[PDB]
Design an enzyme around this catalytic site. Structure first.
Site, PDB file in Angstrom:
ATOM      1  CD  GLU A  39     -89.275  36.820  -8.918  1.00 23.28           C
ATOM      2  OE1 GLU A  39     -89.329  37.459 -10.018  1.00 23.28           O
ATOM      3  OE2 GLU A  39     -89.720  35.658  -8.786  1.00 23.28           O
ATOM      4  CB  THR A  68     -86.832  42.164 -13.223  1.00 26.21           C
ATOM      5  OG1 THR A  68     -88.149  41.864 -12.752  1.00 26.21           O
ATOM      6  CG2 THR A  68     -86.904  42.812 -14.619  1.00 26.21           C
ATOM      7  CE  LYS A 128     -90.058  35.179 -15.065  1.00 27.56           C
ATOM      8  NZ  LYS A 128     -89.599  36.352 -14.212  1.00 27.56           N
TER       9      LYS A 128
END
Lengths: 202, 202, 202, 202
Positions: A39, A68, A128
């Protein structure tokens, strides 16, 4: 397929870095150490370019995504540059919708039952959990009662000492940042190996 | 320039491997650990392809060459695929000539004063000394008397315990195979770091 | 077939002697002790005659060749007298060519990577490594990297204490001179037995 | 005659130095200490001039030659300046031929059986063995088997502790460089005396 990859690999490297070069070297380190889910967070300068320049690793079986992600503009750039999955720290309705139309897997971050339910209403069942160090395995176990069919990928503080507790609580995979990614390339490649073994070991 | 790169980096990874994939992973490991001179030997299956697929690392400052080159046909394939330098275990007049016309740096291997002199007559002053474990630093020191202007890059048995003796004898750089390259990617990246530090340390 | 005999028997007696009679008696001693590959060196007086007079041992399965062959004239005499294989301490292009036209197995001696490569270019992949006591098993192990398909038969200093190390390094067979052949007929026949057992034992 | 001088004197000083003046002073030191065979290497600046200026020592029975001869141009200058013998570290066919036509003794250096045989084919039976410290007395003893009529003059690492082992192995003479020649004139003259006594002593 996105679900099935998380299920199989169990670990996603959450890659923060100060430069394109550092980010690429750490992504290679991690992959060389056995971590296939990578990621690239958008706190990496030119995170776009990093994902594009790692595109070839896909031919070696790496799965490169973006993290992000906080606006649809960032989401577009990541997808345009070959991101196979999008991760955010929060639940973003606009990013959810864009990823739905674009046909790209989105894993929003959630921290509360209300956030969880909103995400489910937007079609998500793999979430998440962030920040994991605040809410802990305890939170994951608590959610099993009312929401047996939700699965979590905690990010935040996951390390060598607690990774097995997380899996005991019922998580689908873990996202590991600084415990994996901080240090030099050599140290990162090595820590990558340790996490894979420790995870296999439970 | 070829001379100057050896002088600056002091170590060339001599990469033998059983597959394209293993060779690429080890070349990345080594580079990530600080080794910029990477020699893909022609005992690697499809060594050609490996050099071509590592071509992008040149943009990160890696210098990718070919080793165990034993015919002009192999030499042509290596150069065609982007090899920046050619290394052989022996002195090959035909490869010398081809590399001269093509304008590519060739480092033949030599083991005797007569071989050394023949190589000098073909225009070479930087020589691979092979096998270093047979002839040792002793040979390098002995050559300084009659041939003060020849410089050696020993390959064969160079390791963590003897690398500094080699540099004490007067070598220009060292070529390190199994002590560096054998093991897993993680172990190789780490051993790479150790060699750079040990070399700096002398 | 020549390859296959070396592979099967693993030991060649390198027979130096001061007379025809001594050479014949030692060749019989060695054969009686289980050594089938017998190399009559051209330092034996009338080495020609010795090979011819041992021709009958071929009917008992002995394989009689010639060693220390240093000119084509010597090579012709050896072949004319029934030599089944030719061995030299050095690499001789003229002897290589003659043996190629005559259809007789030639094993040149080599000591360096450059010599090795020249021999390969002349069609040889089974090489005498000489002098083995100078270059050692270390040399044989070093050659496996760049030249995986070359096989060595070391001559020089091979004895009861080191024969197994040589086989550990990857040699195809060993050539044993003074450790086997020196002494009286009785002592030689006995040492022959010991080498066969020690080799079987590894 | 050249053979016979080596046989009689048993030691040749191999003289490397940084200047004409140093080279001459060391050649005098060595001669004053009993060493009659003096080899001025071509690594000495203006080695030509040094040989010419030592020409008078011939009247006192010194035998002045040239070493580290690597081209026919150097060979011509040495002979033109009065060199009574030519030595090289390697086997040079062109220097062999020139010295043959000019009628001057040439001792090529060799390190392998193949090099040895090539030198014999060019008419040489007295060979420089170089570097002696790599190949050792072991090599000299190994060559006695197949090449009983070749004689060696080792150069490289010969010193006070090993000079007698070399003579035990069967060498014709020894060439001594740094163990003899390094230091001041006084130290060199003295070390010269020690070598003569140590050699006589065996």
């Amino acid at each position: 397929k996105m679900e099935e990859l998380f299920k199989k690999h169990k670990i996603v490297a959450v890659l923060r870095a100060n430069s394109v070069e550092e980010a690429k070297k750490k992504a290679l380190a991690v992959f060389l150490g056995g971590v296939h889910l990578i990621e690239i967070t958008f706190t990496v300068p030119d995170a776009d370019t990093v994902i594009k320049e790692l595109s070839f690793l896909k031919e070696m079986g790496a799965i490169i995504g973006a993290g992000t992600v906080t606006s649809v503009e960032q989401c577009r750039k990541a997808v345009e540059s070959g991101a196979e999955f999008i991760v955010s720290p929060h639940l973003d309705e606009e990013i959810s919708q864009f990823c739905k139309e674009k046909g790209v897997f989105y894993m929003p971050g959630v921290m509360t039952p209300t956030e969880l339910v909103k995400a489910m209403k937007l079609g998500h069942t793999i979430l998440k959990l962030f920040p994991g160090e605040v809410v802990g395995p305890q939170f994951v176990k608590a959610m099993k009662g009312p929401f047996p069919n939700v699965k979590f990928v905690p990010t935040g503080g996951v390390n060598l000492d607690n990774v097995c507790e997380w899996f005991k609580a019922g998580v689908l995979a873990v996202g590991v940042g600084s415990a994996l990614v901080k240090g030099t390339p050599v140290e990162v490649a090595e820590k990558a190996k340790a996490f894979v073994e420790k995870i296999r070991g439970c």
